[PDB]
Design a protein around this ligand. Structure first.
Ligand SMILES: *C/C=C(C)/C=C/C1=C(C)CCCC1(C)C
Length: 137
């Protein structure tokens, strides 16, 4: 499994709903949903070391991590967290997030590469799940 590539979105579900249940107000949701409904996703994978760049009309997020080693991130609604990615299976990784301060919904993201070569991303807050599917350019 090599997640490396530039990935282009073909399906999305529940993105605004995820922001809504996290408490994001409607004005900010509409900006977010417009800016981030065709996110460009680039991955460079070198074994267990990953670089991910997600680009929207208003934000560039670059993440660098090694599977099994804690790193710093912010949650999708902007709260500082410490993150840790593990392999769930050979083709799917899960990022658990812990808030640095205070309490809040349990948040995570996952990335899975299917046999057919699609990339499935999920982002969760408690029991609400956003799912996006991409193909390699
Ligand atoms: C609309 C979906 C996103 C903006 C997702 C971004 C994203 C990934 C696709 C995987 C790495 C984490 C994160 C930046 C949250």
């Amino acid at each position: 499994p090599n997640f490396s590539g530039n990935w282009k979105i073909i399906r999305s579900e529940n993105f605004e709903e995820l922001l809504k249940v996290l408490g994001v107000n409607v004005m900010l949701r509409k900006i977010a949903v417009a800016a981030a409904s065709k996110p460009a996703v680039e991955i460079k994978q070198e074994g267990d070391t990953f670089y991910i760049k997600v680009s929207t009309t208003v934000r560039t997020t670059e993440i660098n991590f090694k599977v099994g080693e804690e790193f710093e991130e912010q949650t999708v609604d902007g709260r500082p967290c410490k993150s840790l990615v593990k392999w769930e299976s050979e083709n799917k990784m899960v990022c658990e997030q812990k808030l640095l301060k205070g309490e809040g919904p349990k948040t995570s993201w996952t990335l899975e590469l299917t046999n057919d070569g699609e990339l499935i991303d999920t982002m969760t807050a408690d029991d609400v799940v956003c799912t996006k599917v991409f193909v390699r350019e």
